[PDB]
Design an enzyme around this catalytic site. Structure first.
Site, PDB file in Angstrom:
ATOM      1  N   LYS A   1       0.913  -1.324   0.031  1.00  0.00           N
ATOM      2  CA  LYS A   1       0.159   0.003   0.016  1.00  0.00           C
ATOM      3  C   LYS A   1       0.690   1.153   0.011  1.00  0.00           C
ATOM      4  O   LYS A   1       0.874   2.268  -0.687  1.00  0.00           O
ATOM      5  CB  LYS A   1      -0.865  -0.057   1.142  1.00  0.00           C
ATOM      6  CG  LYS A   1      -2.076  -1.129   1.315  1.00  0.00           C
ATOM      7  CD  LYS A   1      -2.845  -0.854   2.462  1.00  0.00           C
ATOM      8  CE  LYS A   1      -2.126  -1.130   3.598  1.00  0.00           C
ATOM      9  NZ  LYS A   1      -1.602  -2.572   3.826  1.00  0.00           N
ATOM     10  N   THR A   2       2.037   1.410   0.857  1.00  0.00           N
ATOM     11  CA  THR A   2       2.752   2.583   1.127  1.00  0.00           C
ATOM     12  C   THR A   2       3.378   2.718  -0.431  1.00  0.00           C
ATOM     13  O   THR A   2       3.536   3.945  -0.824  1.00  0.00           O
ATOM     14  CB  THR A   2       3.644   2.471   2.175  1.00  0.00           C
ATOM     15  OG1 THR A   2       2.929   1.994   3.320  1.00  0.00           O
ATOM     16  CG2 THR A   2       4.393   3.626   2.235  1.00  0.00           C
TER      17      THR A   2
ATOM     18  N   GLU B   1      -3.479   6.475   1.873  1.00  0.00           N
ATOM     19  CA  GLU B   1      -3.188   5.062   2.294  1.00  0.00           C
ATOM     20  C   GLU B   1      -4.456   4.635   3.179  1.00  0.00           C
ATOM     21  O   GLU B   1      -4.608   5.218   4.256  1.00  0.00           O
ATOM     22  CB  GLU B   1      -1.828   4.708   2.859  1.00  0.00           C
ATOM     23  CG  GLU B   1      -1.778   3.203   3.197  1.00  0.00           C
ATOM     24  CD  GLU B   1      -0.398   2.993   3.634  1.00  0.00           C
ATOM     25  OE1 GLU B   1       0.359   3.416   3.040  1.00  0.00           O
ATOM     26  OE2 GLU B   1      -0.101   2.050   4.532  1.00  0.00           O
TER      27      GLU B   1
END
Ligand code: ZN
Length: 480
Positions: free
Chosen positions: A123-124, A167
């Site tokens: 995700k990051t 996020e």
């Protein structure tokens, strides 16, 4: 145009955390008054104090008198602060609303075109790629990135643009607080179930999230992941626009990874975009500065998200070419020596078997550009429960390395389980291996086992990241 009335004078319990600090920064940049409290003083607390936040160290009820007229809301995070915290008790006693960080972030994103990135892992990196691509195209989006890697990669920014990139955590149910215009989903794997108790409820959180997409929105989704492919089908049957990306060609694919190669300067991929997006020229070349094929897949996700809001595909590809990676994602910690005989030390957050295999495959492809180095991994298992469940899969994934050092389990506030240690993982690795439960002994041993041209990866979600520099020191002392 305005902060909602409940966010005008906000007191934040645990404001020193990177996510809470980013939220406080955005609140301040939009004319809010912010007070806060934290257990330990830190550089983030100092920076927020310098911007006008009244922050007390240590939690105490008096902190609720810091703001003029009292706080309109108290912001906490359930993962870090217990309900028995004194300030939460005082807040409930006076009748001041108590909210979690995701609800505040949702209120901050209101009125913007929102691009949310979620998934079990990646995700990051994907959020950061999307932010970098948008900024390369001349935009100034607001954003809040970070969480999956702990403090690593966490950042937030109030921008002048109409976009907001965030996020979204899927491990604590935060997903359902958001209303995305574009939702990107990297993968759905059988993990992070500690909040949900079952694979079924965890997978269901993603279906609810997909239902929360605004009418006329879009779901960018990776379909090489099984959970992602199943969710893409389910979303197509809800009538929602689904932009699939992956490696298998198809009529319903928005972007396809046709090929990928690691070279000396960087990675290069060949991709096909759906004719609706961009132009008729068929095969595009996407270069990247980060290693690994999975990074190319992440970049495809960010590209589709960016194109959905009107950015040109070719310029987005130019922007993705300049993405350099986030902290603890195959991050070069350092180098001993020069050229082909140098030893490089990298740091990575991998703690799911798929992540481990992806990182080691990237390391092997990097090695294949050299002239005969070895891959040495220093792996720290992340939880007692995770280790007990997954030890065989962890060892199987670690077998991709040439040498493995296994550390003891990092507990991370979990209750220790009888019979579980790092050796539970070490039992399952087939390649040359050493079990090093003494942390302070690791660096030296690794330094003694190193050969010129070796690639060394410290891997894990806990303390292991501190070993990177030490190893380097122990290598340079070895250079006599
Ligand atoms: Zn995880």
């Amino acid at each position: 145009e305005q902060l909602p009335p409940d966010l005008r004078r906000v007191h934040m319990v645990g404001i020193g955390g990177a996510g809470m600090s980013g939220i406080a920064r955005i609140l301040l940049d939009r004319g809010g008054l912010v007070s806060g409290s934290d257990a330990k003083e830190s550089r983030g607390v100092h920076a927020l104090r310098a911007r006008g936040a009244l922050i007390r160290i240590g939690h105490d009820a008096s902190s609720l008198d810091l703001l003029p007229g009292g706080a309109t809301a108290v912001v906490t995070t359930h993962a870090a602060i217990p309900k028995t915290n004194p300030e939460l008790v005082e807040a409930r006693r006076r009748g001041i609303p108590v909210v979690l960080r995701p609800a505040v972030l949702a209120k901050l994103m209101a009125g913007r075109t929102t691009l949310m990135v979620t998934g079990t892992h990646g995700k990051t990196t994907t959020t950061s790629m999307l932010i970098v691509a948008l900024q390369h195209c001349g935009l100034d989006p607001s954003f809040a990135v970070g969480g999956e890697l702990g403090e690593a990669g966490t950042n937030a920014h109030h921008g002048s643009g109409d976009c907001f990139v965030a996020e979204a955590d899927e491990s604590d149910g935060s997903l359902l607080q958001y209303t995305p215009h574009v939702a990107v989903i990297t993968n759905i794997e059988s993990d992070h179930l500690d909040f949900y108790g079952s694979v079924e409820a965890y997978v269901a959180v993603f279906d609810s999230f997909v239902e929360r997409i605004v009418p006329g929105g879009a779901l960018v989704v990776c379909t090489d992941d099984p959970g992602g492919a199943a969710l893409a089908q389910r979303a197509t049957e809800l009538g929602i626009r689904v932009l699939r990306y992956g490696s298998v060609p198809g009529e319903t694919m928005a972007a396809t990874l046709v090929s990928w190669q690691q070279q000396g300067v960087g990675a290069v991929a060949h991709i096909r975009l759906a004719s609706e997006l961009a132009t008729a020229q068929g095969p595009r070349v996407m270069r990247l500065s980060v290693p690994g094929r999975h990074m190319a897949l992440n970049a495809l996700g960010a590209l589709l998200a960016a194109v959905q809001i009107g950015a040109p595909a070719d310029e987005v590809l130019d922007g993705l070419a300049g993405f350099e990676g986030v902290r603890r994602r195959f991050e070069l910690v350092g180098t001993c020596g020069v050229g082909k005989a140098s030893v490089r030390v990298f740091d990575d957050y991998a703690h799911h078997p798929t992540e481990i295999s992806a990182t080691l495959a990237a390391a092997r492809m990097v090695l294949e550009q050299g002239d005969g180095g070895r891959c040495m991994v220093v792996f720290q298992p992340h939880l007692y429960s995770r280790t007990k469940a997954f030890a065989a899969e962890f060892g199987r994934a670690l077998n991709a390395a040439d040498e493995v050092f296994v550390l003891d389990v990092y507990g991370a506030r979990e209750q220790p389980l009888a019979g579980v240690s790092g050796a539970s993982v070490a039992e399952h690795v087939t390649v040359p291996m050493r079990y090093v439960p003494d942390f302070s002994a690791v660096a030296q041993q690794v330094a003694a086992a190193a050969s010129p041209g070796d690639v060394i990866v410290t891997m894990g979600a806990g303390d292991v990241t501190l070993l990177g520099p030490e190893i380097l020191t122990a290598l340079r002392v070895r250079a006599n």
